[PDB]
Design a binder for this molecule. Structure first.
Ligand SMILES: CC(C)(COP(=O)(O)OP(=O)(O)OC[C@H]1O[C@@H](n2cnc3c(N)ncnc32)[C@H](O)[C@@H]1OP(=O)(O)O)[C@@H](O)C(=O)NCCC(=O)NCCS
Ligand SMILES: CCCCCCCCCCCCCCCC(=O)O
Ligand SMILES: CCCCCCCCCCCCCCCC(=O)O
Lengths: 352, 352
């Protein structure tokens, strides 16, 4: 399997972090809590975010059911955008696609978003669908891996991943908890989309983007409370534990070594790191765990500062940032994600 | 890919269609519509269903969050039950599984169920997890078809599908409107797992089940409203068009014909039919359009009568029934499911 295109899309409204935070302490009911808000919004190392709605409008998003309706509607719009983008990048057409997968965690669609996306693009009635849901922040790297798995049974085939994540819209569930506030500091809105072709298909089509050689999942024992949704009348409420960072610190070198020893490669063999931006404490703990020098990760940081945490979408935006800055050809690349599980996923790549 | 193990798990308490009606007509807010209730409950051709919760508890099950957490607790239980049974039947062990696909439309689990089930039975930490939401009633055929798609490219592998539908628990979204009541008369609670194995590993574990040969998805354009959920503060409220049947009548034969030709076969080279029991009106419509004899779909008719509509999991029950009845060796079976999309999935099989 060979990546033929990468494209991200973002909502038209962008605000600076402090615009956001300025309006946000003035929100219904947050003014008792304004200091820990500013403190966290400020250590978050996000410089702006995209919002699928005008900033003005968020305090009137207290109904879950309205929020999710708007999610359906907005989410397709943007997934359609990034897929047109990647297919252009991949010089291809929707008629071409033999498998679509969608990944989200910030809304509940039925029919699922791929259904809606195929409907919109005039995808071939027989397209195989794969609506991945509860995967979270890991689904960017897991999606690429699921695609690879596909194009391994179906060489001559074309597969897309689309990821929409509209983290703003989850706002009916925000309370002034530390964990809700943390994500209030971190999350933004955006989509991304990855076209990839099986090995037979890559020549004919001229596939640009890199090879997808392998992936490994790593699921942690008794770690469900690390990341999750408390789902209810309020919608989708963050569970996000402090323990997350020290797990990484403790178990992450080993996921990497086990996955790279099967290739007889070392950390030193990675030409480019493609790593999910959990936010400052998560990037550090990565960088510390595998002891990377500040530049292996500069593009993940530069993504987090620019657009904030786009959940599963961020790792693909960032993948796109690396493909462009055009790495040492025939070198190795490692995608690295984690989400609800708790799990990690690693994706082995080789540039052109 | 070759099935090795199928298994349905089911909530301990079975209730009569009649005692379920006679209790349901006394539920807070229902006695006024007793008459339509009786009429839809008798009209449905379902003689008993299992419920996850005792019957008399459902009137108190008014909060989505309470329902959603009850779901997660019980769905895991029931899913690992299904799974372990399939494994046994395949004679394999939780550790041998190299990817678990997971299937629900009935609860919102993050971490996902596959995540949870995998901790429960201890699958390897690097099991490949494939969490499907939003395929709903088509998921039983859909999931078996992505099992093959996986195993095509992994001939030594083991992949499992685990379906769990706990329709009951949607009760907080239930109000006495017609589509909703139609729901209270068909849907029951249960779980199926399939254990599949790839082509070279079939020879080894000596895989008993049907060989999985092919799949055709078929997504009907502009039918996103025929069925799915209006998701809200109140939970998962069913959307179901009275138009659904009519589209099966119209568009099914061609879907079946286009697929068996590709294969050089006929409606009548089919050894056994495994159909989704969506409604007697559905089943008729399917038999009507395919101009099948009454025997073709008897196990479906009986599965409906015996444990209700179990959304995705129903077909996998009917598929275990079918295996059990042993259709003529080396003949061809056909899986046929329908659901939110609107779509159909066909799965071509070959019985031992
Ligand atoms: C309802 C059922 C039990 C049979 O019902 P029945 O009482 O013999 O006859 P009908 O289907 O005509 O239903 C009676 C009335 O309810 C209406 N109705 C039936 N299903 C309806 C729905 N899903 N939404 C709205 N109205 C519906 C009918 O239009 C009819 O109304 P009318 O008398 O006002 O014109 C059932 O078999 C059915 O029709 N369901 C469809 C199956 C389905 O959709 N599959 C589920 C997905 S797995
Ligand atoms: C401005 C609104 C953002 C504040 C609310 C944060 C909502 C996003 C939190 C979920 C992030 C998605 C992935 C994280 C883990 C998960 O729950 O799956
Ligand atoms: C006392 C018993 C009540 C039983 C449940 C009544 C409401 C059932 C709602 C069923 C929804 C079925 C959804 C799945 C199939 C689909 O969406 O594909």
């Amino acid at each position: 399997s060979v990546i033929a295109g990468v494209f991200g899309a973002l909502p038209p409204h962008r605000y600076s972090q402090s615009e956001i935070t300025d309006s946000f302490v003035e929100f219904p009911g947050l003014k008792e809590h304004e200091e820990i808000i500013r403190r966290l919004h400020a250590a978050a190392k996000v410089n702006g975010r995209h919002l699928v709605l005008p900033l003005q409008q968020y305090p009137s998003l207290t109904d879950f059911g309205d929020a999710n309706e708007i999610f359906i509607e907005k989410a397709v719009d943007l997934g359609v955008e990034a897929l047109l983008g990647a297919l252009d990048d991949a010089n291809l057409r929707p008629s071409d696609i033999d498998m679509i997968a969608t990944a989200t965690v910030t809304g509940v669609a039925v029919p699922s978003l791929d259904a809606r996306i195929a409907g919109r693009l005039g995808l071939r009635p027989d397209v195989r669908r794969m609506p991945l849901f509860g995967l979270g922040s890991v689904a960017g790297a897991a999606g690429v891996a699921r695609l690879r798995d596909y194009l391994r049974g179906a060489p001559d085939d074309v597969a897309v991943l689309v990821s929409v994540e509209l983290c703003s819209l989850t706002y009916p569930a925000v309370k002034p908890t530390v964990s809700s506030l943390v994500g209030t500091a971190l999350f933004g809105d955006g989509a991304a989309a990855v076209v990839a072709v099986g090995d037979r298909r890559a020549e004919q089509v001229r596939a640009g983007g890199p090879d997808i050689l392998d992936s490994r999942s790593s699921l942690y024992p008794d770690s469900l409370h690390i990341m999750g949704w408390d789902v209810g009348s309020h919608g989708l409420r963050l569970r996000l534990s402090p323990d997350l960072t020290n797990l990484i610190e403790r178990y992450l070198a080993n996921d990497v070594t086990t996955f790279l020893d099967a290739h007889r490669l070392t950390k030193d063999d990675i030409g480019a790191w493609v790593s999910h931006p959990g936010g400052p404490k998560v990037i550090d703990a990565v960088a510390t765990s595998l002891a990377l020098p500040p530049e292996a990760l500069e593009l993940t940081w530069r993504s987090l500062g620019e657009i904030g945490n786009l959940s599963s979408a961020s790792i693909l935006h960032i993948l796109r940032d690396t493909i462009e800055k055009r790495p040492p050809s025939g070198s190795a690349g490692l995608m690295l994600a984690m989400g609800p599980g708790f799990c990690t996923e690693l994706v082995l790549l080789r540039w052109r």
